[PDB]
């Protein structure tokens, strides 16, 4: 079994996203090991296709990209209490801070390493998770101005998280942008200029160009998965195809597929999913086991290829179809395949 | 792993193996460590189970068996799921026992015996109602094994089947018929085994020479309706609290704002999500244990984080404090079975889920 990532599709999706972003620079989001597609290979491909920067949640993710030889800018924005920012600084990793405590921790690491931090501030425009709130932003701006005066930080970015990953027309997107503009006015009042400001995820990138600031941060759309499923594929091509070989044929006629829920085939797909074998759809029957399940063939031989999901070009189910059956989202579908499902690549 | 961990208590594994050996009576135990030890770590659990009296190990694939061998495991290892056209040579050269479930597979194994010159320690997997050799094909299987055994191409170690209520008695009766058909055709196996964890613990009258528990080794109940059956779940999934914050009544939480605070309250941010194995459908249903108190999840589970409600009572949580998502339940935390109930699955799938930011760690047995 394998989870075949078509880097040609990644490259195509990156090119589509850049058309929508217009003059804005694109930050390809490759957290969670490239949403299960492989952070390093997707990153290399996106940068080749015109992405300017990479975005990840954790410094650990950023250090992994650096260790694989990535030299492009990388921004990390989720830091657990206790983190040592020193390794990030020595590896030229940009850090988004979301509290004065995080800033103070970063500054101690700047003095320790002797390395000026390229810093972004993450503010709360409505998600209400971890961004700096409006009342705390002035104090943060003052501390940043002081630190920048002593050449301890370079003030690169202002960023915020969108509330809706898939609801572009909701006026909360417009509200969050108005709130973001207000934060920028607060900075002006404190004599601070950020190099760039960014709020857009994939949904906002493709559908709200009127809310684009200096950079866009698409993730899901890089992998070809529609950020607004009710609109169809949005001209993207899902990059991941999950397939496995028929391990046994047994008589109707059934095929044994040797992957199961420990490999990420959601157990709740039992008796509901279909797979594509030699052009035809074959429904799963019976439970998904830990490492195998059966499908009903109703012209198939041991070793033949069964496709569980993909872009849909050959009539195979899509990750969205799995999301529909399971009651989830394709984000969770593509971060599931593992174990016996080996990640592979189709070169572009 | 500082951020989050799936901590496996090897003292619990030892206790569970001891319990299983008690139930197995005179029979020996094959501890089943397929799927990287049901998410607990095949090698570490294998080492601990053998040290607690397990006689042998069971896995699905030869690849799993080779991984144990490469980590220095020398005990017997049996593999029973093989892709068509497998070259059994490496298994024979690594002293991996092979269970065959078809005549075609036996032919593949006997070819590998001819190519390598290594006798195979063979087990036949028969179909008692569940793959497997069927009654129709078994007479031809026995004639061939008698032939291979006479030239010492194989050592005839095992006869096995897998259990799929009187249906249990029916499979056992079919299994005994296989043993009789082999005995009357003069083909003797060293050992016969039918029993998984459920049979081992609940149907001792159906114990043959060996039992093959998996799930109960990890302390998870093989008959959940009967309770913990004296076993202790070995996996505890826990994470450090990354942020504590206050919110006002009326404020939304997490992507989509699917939860609106009915009152001013305090929340904690736990930095693991569905890409780490926290099923997204647990959103708004699961509870965590923090400093002895249950805290419900609020809002959607995100890719790598979610939020829990600490309540508006005096704050008793700090950043860096420990949140327990599930465990054996000794401290009042949820169990893997609780998760299985909430999302409509089985604990087998729960414990094979944690990954990503959830680092597997080990507590040594005292």
Residue numbers in the entry:
A (entry chain B): 14 to 264, 283 to 329, 334 to 383
B (entry chain A): 11 to 140, 143 to 176, 183 to 384
Original authors' sentences:
Alanine racemase (Alr) is a pyridoxal 5′-phosphate-dependent enzyme that catalyzes the racemization of l-alanine to d-alanine. Alr is one of the two targets of the broad-spectrum antibiotic d-cycloserine (DCS), a structural analogue of d-alanine. We demonstrated that Alr plays a central role in DCS resistance in M. tuberculosis, and identified that mutation of Asp 322 to Asn (D322N) confers resistance to DCS. Kinetic characterization of the D322N variant showed that this alteration reduces the affinity (Ki) of Alr for DCS 240-fold.
